[PDB]
Amino acid sequence: RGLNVELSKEISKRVVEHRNRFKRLMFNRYLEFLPLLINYTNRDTVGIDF
Amino acid sequence: KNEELMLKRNYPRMATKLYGNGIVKKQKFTLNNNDTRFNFQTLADATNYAL
Amino acid sequence: MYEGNNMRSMMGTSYEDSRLNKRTELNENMSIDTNKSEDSYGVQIHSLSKQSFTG
Amino acid sequence: GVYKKKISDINVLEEKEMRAMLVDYSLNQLSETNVRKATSKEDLASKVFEA
Amino acid sequence: VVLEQRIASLEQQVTTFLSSQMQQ
Amino acid sequence: VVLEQRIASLEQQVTTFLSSQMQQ
Amino acid sequence: VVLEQRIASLEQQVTTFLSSQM
Amino acid sequence: VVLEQRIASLEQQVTTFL
Amino acid sequence: VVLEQRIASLEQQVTTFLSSQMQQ
Amino acid sequence: VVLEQRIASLEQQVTTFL
Amino acid sequence: VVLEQRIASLEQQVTTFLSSQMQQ
Amino acid sequence: VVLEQRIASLEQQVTTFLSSQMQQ
Amino acid sequence: VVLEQRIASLEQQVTTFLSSQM
Amino acid sequence: VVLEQRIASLEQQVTTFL
Amino acid sequence: VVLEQRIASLEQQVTTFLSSQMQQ
Amino acid sequence: VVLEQRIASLEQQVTTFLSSQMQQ
Amino acid sequence: FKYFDDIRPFLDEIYKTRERYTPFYDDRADYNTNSKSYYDYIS
Amino acid sequence: EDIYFIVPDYLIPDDCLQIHKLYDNCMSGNFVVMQNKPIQYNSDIEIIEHYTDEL
């Protein structure tokens, strides 16, 4: 075992983790969505996985 | 030579080789969603990077 | 032989083929299309098309 | 077969654990008014039939 | 019309009894 | 029609299964 | 629906055949 | 005809027997 | 109609299985 | 019809296969 | 019509492929 | 109409079996 | 659609021919 | 005619054979 | 109709390939 | 009508093959 | 094994830094204060 | 021509391809290229990095 916790300004590391995880999440979510906006009269007759 | 040599047997002889197992080989990769977006200033080039 | 329900979720349904896909290929062909030096007794040097490899 | 026998074992496990809890209820609990002392093994048949 | 329903009901009755003793 | 052929065929298979292999 | 029902009957008949020679 | 359909399933059953 | 298409589909499958059994 | 003729030719091929 | 010619041609190619080169 | 669909289904069945042993 | 189906059949026939002389 | 179309595919197959 | 146009397109392609094979 | 399209398709096929060996 | 190597390509190694792109807004350096730079420099 | 890289396997045209843009309106054999953006100046994977830190 190994344990000796910092303080309860652990929150001041939890706060910056929330910021860092929010940037990572919002960035890759926004490009997770962005390649589907158009879809253009979806598969009328045409064999394309749009 | 004597006539009872007809009773004496002669087996065909064998020449073999055993091989056994091969190798399972693997190869992995680990693609990210934040640190690669510090680089790669266009998103489409990140998708091209991915494939 | 024994049935039970031979499809369980994974690795009871993986002792069969399990989606043979993208087998390793000679789509680009070494020793025939490349590694090739049977290039005809031509006339001139006409062109060599340069393509930006987007894909 | 590994899957079928490790549902079979949990069957066996809970049934023997439930007969275990019946028996130790009978011994560690269930106050002495409800016990009836037999003396032999066929005395038990008469006792349970009147009970 | 009525038969179409009873014929469907009896085929499921055969199928759920064949699987009780099947090799499947 | 062919529905009568289907109803005749399913009674045949029901008789076959319920008479040959098992009782249930 | 009728076609599906017919297909089911055919499958059951095949299954029955696959268990006994009679 | 429907008799051809009946003859086809008997051939299917005989093939499954083999 | 559609039952005729199903009967055509089943004899094609039986012929394919028979060609799977016997080499030719 | 012609589909019935093709179905008859297919049962003949199935009988020749057996 | 020509659809019957197409259905006759595809059974011929199916018989050819499933009888000549392989079983699957 | 029905044939048009079965003829399409069997051509894909031939094409996905020819590619199992193709030079392609 | 029918024309496309016919074209597909022609292509498959050609492919089949390109593998065996029979 | 459709027989001309049938004769054309046989010529196509014979040309692909060569 | 459109199948006739396809049959005209295929014989033109076969003639072009035959002219590709034999020099004239 | 159908020909008008195939005649247009083959003229572009001639024009994009003439320019492969043209003086132009 | 006596090699007076040379004097100049050793005195540049103490004044050399690669300066890779460590991204800001990550947990590699959370507060990005100027202390981890000191650790990684003196070590 | 089909000089470019081709991702499908056997479905290749093996024949006269073309770009169908300006040779005519509606006539040439089809292989049309589609840009993401008509004139390209900056990738928008940089703009999405530009606001997400401020956000």
Tab-separated table of N, CA and C in Angstrom, chain P residues 5-16:
chain	number	residue	atom	x	y	z
P	5	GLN	N	-29.425	9.748	-75.698
P	5	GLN	CA	-28.505	9.709	-74.566
P	5	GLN	C	-27.301	8.825	-74.856
P	6	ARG	N	-27.528	7.665	-75.471
P	6	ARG	CA	-26.415	6.787	-75.808
P	6	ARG	C	-25.567	7.381	-76.920
P	7	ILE	N	-26.199	8.093	-77.856
P	7	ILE	CA	-25.445	8.769	-78.904
P	7	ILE	C	-24.604	9.893	-78.327
P	8	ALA	N	-25.091	10.536	-77.267
P	8	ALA	CA	-24.288	11.551	-76.593
P	8	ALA	C	-23.159	10.917	-75.802
P	9	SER	N	-23.404	9.742	-75.225
P	9	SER	CA	-22.377	9.094	-74.416
P	9	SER	C	-21.243	8.573	-75.279
P	10	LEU	N	-21.571	7.986	-76.424
P	10	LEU	CA	-20.527	7.487	-77.312
P	10	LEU	C	-19.760	8.606	-77.997
P	11	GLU	N	-20.349	9.776	-78.273
P	11	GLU	CA	-19.550	10.863	-78.861
P	11	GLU	C	-18.513	11.412	-77.905
P	12	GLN	N	-18.846	11.497	-76.615
P	12	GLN	CA	-17.849	11.878	-75.624
P	12	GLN	C	-16.786	10.801	-75.479
P	13	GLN	N	-17.173	9.536	-75.663
P	13	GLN	CA	-16.202	8.448	-75.621
P	13	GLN	C	-15.244	8.517	-76.799
P	14	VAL	N	-15.729	8.953	-77.958
P	14	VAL	CA	-14.838	9.130	-79.098
P	14	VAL	C	-13.956	10.349	-78.889
P	15	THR	N	-14.509	11.402	-78.281
P	15	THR	CA	-13.768	12.653	-78.152
P	15	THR	C	-12.693	12.563	-77.077
P	16	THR	N	-12.918	11.749	-76.052
P	16	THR	CA	-11.931	11.620	-74.989
P	16	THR	C	-10.934	10.521	-75.308
